[PDB]
Amino acid sequence: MLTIETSKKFDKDLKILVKNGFDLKLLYKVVGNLATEQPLAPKYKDHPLKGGLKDFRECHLKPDLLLVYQIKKQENTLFLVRLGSHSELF
């Protein structure tokens, strides 16, 4: 399967959600849904970004939370990017 990587800005994102209301295992648990992309909220539904950067896609595991990440088939790994909410971060 594909591993799970983390970025810098990402580490600073969870710290803001964990205080307001978030779980640690939730991420390692949602990974199974990120690789398959089954839920992603029916009304939301994951989608690409396009515009010079095709290797970039964001989803929403929760009804009020996004999740930007980038896949790397070169070594089958799931590298995350961002995660949280617009109102939360700002």
Domain chopping of the chain, boundaries: 1-90
Q: Is 5 annotated as a binding residue?
A: no
> Which residues, 6+ apart, have CB-to-CB distance to 59 below 8 Å?
34, 37, 40, 44, 46, 66, 67, 69
CATH architecture entry for 1-90? 2-Layer Sandwich (3.30)
Tell me which residue of 90, 85, 47 sits closest to 69, measured CA to CA. Answer: 47
From residue 52, how far is each of 55, 57, 68 by CA, in Å?
9, 13, 16
Cα 36 from Cα 61, distance rounded (Å): 12
Token pair 């991420």 is found at 27
Q: Which residue has the tokens 């930007």?
A: 68
Could you tell me which residues come within 8 angstroms of residue 60 by beta carbon, excluding any fewer than 6 positions away? 40, 41, 44, 46, 66, 67
CA distances from 80 to 5, 35, 62 (A): 6, 12, 16
Establish whether 47 is an annotated binding residue.
yes
Flag whether 60 is marked binding.
yes
Q: 86: closest CA among 16, 26, 11?
A: 16
Positions marked active-site: 86
| Residue 37 in marked binding region | no
